[PDB]
Design a binder for this molecule. Structure first.
Ligand code: NA
Length: 128
């Protein structure tokens, strides 16, 4: 599913993402745009791991895709649950990811496209 901007924004607010571990909704939104373009089916293949879904969660430490060497499955979820039109499991696993010391900097794209920039644009006009 390819979410529209405010639609995705309303779902994340409802799922408790706003201000979670100090990460504003606008930042979660900025991360999702750059990582997947709001598409839940987004998949990126690297040599030894695959990134899944809307937040591009990695198969090495987070989900089990049954084909990754050294998999820890910290989210205790199959990676296929991160390619669902329903994003409740992805939000839940993304919350776990930022509980780690790196926080949202775990994603290089956030650092390069969102960090220290005006991200108000992602939620303006959404009533969120
Ligand atoms: Na894993």
């Amino acid at each position: 599913k390819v979410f529209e901007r405010c639609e995705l924004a309303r779902t994340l607010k409802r799922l408790g993402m706003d201000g979670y571990r100090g990460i504003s909704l606008a930042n979660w939104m900025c991360l999702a745009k750059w990582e997947s373009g709001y598409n839940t089916r987004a998949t990126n293949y690297n040599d030894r791991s695959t990134d899944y879904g809307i937040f591009q969660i990695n198969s090495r430490y987070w989900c089990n895709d049954g084909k990754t060497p050294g998999a820890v499955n910290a989210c205790h979820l199959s990676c296929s649950a991160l390619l669902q039109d329903n994003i409740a499991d992805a939000v839940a696993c993304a919350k776990r990811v930022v509980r780690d010391p790196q926080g949202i900097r775990a994603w290089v794209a956030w650092r390069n496209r969102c960090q220290n920039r005006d991200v108000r644009q992602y939620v303006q006009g959404c009533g969120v």
